[model samples]
Target: DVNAKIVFDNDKVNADNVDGLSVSEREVKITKPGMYTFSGTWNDGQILVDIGKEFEAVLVLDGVNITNTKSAPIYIKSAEKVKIELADGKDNVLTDAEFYEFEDPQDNKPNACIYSRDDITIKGNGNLTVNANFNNGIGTSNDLKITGGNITVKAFNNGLKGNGSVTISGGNIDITAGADGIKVENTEEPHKGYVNITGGTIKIRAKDDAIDSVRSVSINNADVKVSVGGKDVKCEGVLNIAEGCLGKLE
Candidate 1:
């Protein structure tokens, strides 16, 4: 059940504030936790989550296209956890049309296609395409997880980057990145920043390491392929592979 809904367009932003959903300069900001759905096309706008630290929200992107050159397309400023769900049988796209030139570097913006400060999980049964000319395709400061979806990414730096940890349950992810395709690192908890892949079909064409983890990597079941200029998989701690078909193209 959705608590609020918003329809975005270039000329106008219509938010159903009956459930307390608000909009400011076309930024659909969610205040409370619950399920929220966004639809329509936004040429130069953003969807932000400005809820408190104790609240979690779910964002359902149903047939939406968003592009932001000034900042991130989807910015999760604050939340306990944010679940970005691509609607079933829908096609969604998020693009950072150009690199964001921030006036304040300390504004907590990751300058990515989809940037989130807290934990974020992307899951659904649809196709999602992300193009990031600035930095990462999806960058999260806390834990990041991905479930079922057909995801494609082209980024200047990393494809999917999580400073705390990264976990891929199921998905068909294709990434072409300037740096690592998947990167997980945490200076605070050196042992917590890891990559756990249980199920997925991931293909990476990275200029740097294919999968770079500062702590460790645990692959339970994943059909992975990589074409990289550097190491295919570089982990500082350990690499544990239970069952999977991994192919290296370089």
Candidate 2:
């Protein structure tokens, strides 16, 4: 990766009008209830919001240059309506994932890129890359909905994991994991959830199962690439494909 440092322009953002308050160099706190937009390249890291239930958080990123040179970058938690706009940056070249690289210590924080407990939505019109040394790229406690986006995650664990059912509607998801790409496991033995894929092109390379669920999973008309270190698809309950292309390579 080029040694060229990324930057985040506070001027390019409308924090005052949007009711968005800056917390630090690469973070924002929603003091008021409204929409917030973030534009520019954060030199070290970019946009980590610690939200409350009373506020509606909307994160719009054109080309979010998240670089965790020495420490962990980008952390989101306890928010409702967490949204990211990806179409903002459309440069000809994409900075390789290595541009946001770091080492994994024995002990690490819970979140790597995005960690949410409330409602979260990711809409990618541009490119959003999350480089995690440990844990998943995005992990949620409740619901995770990807309406539209192009997301690339490189993590030591799963790419995207949640306690609730995971649904991928649109976008290009490329996840290379040290563990499972997408994992949904409920330790409480809760209601059996499912993985319903209605759209988007997903490519996963993992050290464990590419996608794993406790109950049932179904796929619709979509393009999926899965390379697993363990079972390609494993269901303790049921596995069904309503549509889409699936393969397991030895």
Candidate 3:
């Protein structure tokens, strides 16, 4: 709510990247595959990317705050990958509605606060916060990877939901959710839905499982602390903890 760059809801699609951002009328359509940096505040608005399937986009968040009551604050319509970079030394926050009153769920582009269809990778030295009142804080149809940053999430459902795989190599994450803290499930494929935590400092509190993987789970050289109403860590296939410190729930 500070000095934020308000993102206007542009109705129609535009031309190339050069012409995409230069809008006198503020067309919200992103027509090209490139890095788009946003700072300040975005209220009751969302970013929808419209590009070819071969192109990937990078959304740079430099001291940004976004909130939406109707839909996800960040939605990825179509892209190869959406790489979100939290700008260094800055703090970014995102908040969504607690409940959605959509007539049809099929029309909903992204179901979660930060939802994407393709893969998503978040890496930065900044701080990021997400408050998801509806379903999830971060949801991806494919893979979700977090390599760096200081992240905090409070959600009603899962804190992080990846339909394919979820990988956390480096970060400082604290999550509190009504359901699972982190979940990965890909029932249609082999070795697709899983969670890999190689190195990080993670703390979780959840009503359900803290970390749930449909296929497998691997944790190596990390410090994980979890408190959940259900299982702390549940995996349908395999669970391997090569090196880590896991604390029991209180």
Candidate 4:
């Protein structure tokens, strides 16, 4: 079992223009507790970046194509801040169309792209588009925030979820799903939690509530659109929208 750690210094050049990315595509073992970087240049194939056990990890990507990519690809079993980002620089255009087909092949699960233990923040300048034949887009455990980039999710269930506290400050987000477009609610665990939408323009084309909340779902300053689900118009227990305009489009 061989694990490689890339120590980039001055005058480090990449033939394919990528550094910190593991060359040998296998379960590379990591050592100790530290900030390990795994930069990827994902082509048409898929790559899995696993963070074993519990860890405070940061994943960076450049010119990364995550297509037909599946399984909590980067499983953060630990860590409160699973900071993921697309390199902030030129020549970092990600092909969302080329990285749209994603499914978690681990189990008969729904939201599999990301499953964090505590809090997860996904910040990137790249486009993350998922055209899935199954579950949600990005699911969270405690709090989930998406700041930056254009994200499109076409899922069979809820597009994006904040199982606890969810917020979207910036980014171009579009969701087409069979269930709620963007849902923030509790996970049937005794009593659910809270979902807060602070900002962002959202649209949901589904058979259910475009955006939903449980316990308490709050919103403030957002341009949103949604079609009726022909289901329960109101949420269970309680629901809240601090502010936001949502309805069927023209």
Task: Give the residue spans of candidate 2 off by over 4 A.
Answer: 1-20, 69-72, 88-109, 187-192, 248-250
Ranking by lDDT: 1, 3, 2, 4
Q: Between candidates 2 and 4, which one is better according to lDDT?
A: 2
Instruction: Please report the TM-score between candidate 3 and the true structure.
Output: 0.88
- State model 2's lDDT: 0.63
- Estimate TM-scores for all models: 0.94, 0.78, 0.88, 0.67
Which ranking of candidates, highest TM-score first?
1, 3, 2, 4
Which parts of model 1 have CA positions greater than 4 angstroms off?
103-108
lDDT of each: 0.86, 0.63, 0.80, 0.53
Please give, for residues 159-246, the per-residue lDDT of candidate 3 as tens digits. 9999999999989999999999999989887668889999888999999999999988988888889999999789988888874467
Q: Candidate 4, which segments miss by more than 4 Å at Cα?
A: 1-55, 68-72, 88-111, 187-192, 228-234, 237-244
Instruction: Report how far off residue 233 is in candidate 3 (Å).
Output: 0.9
Greater-lDDT candidate between 3 and 4: 3
Name the top TM-score candidate.
1
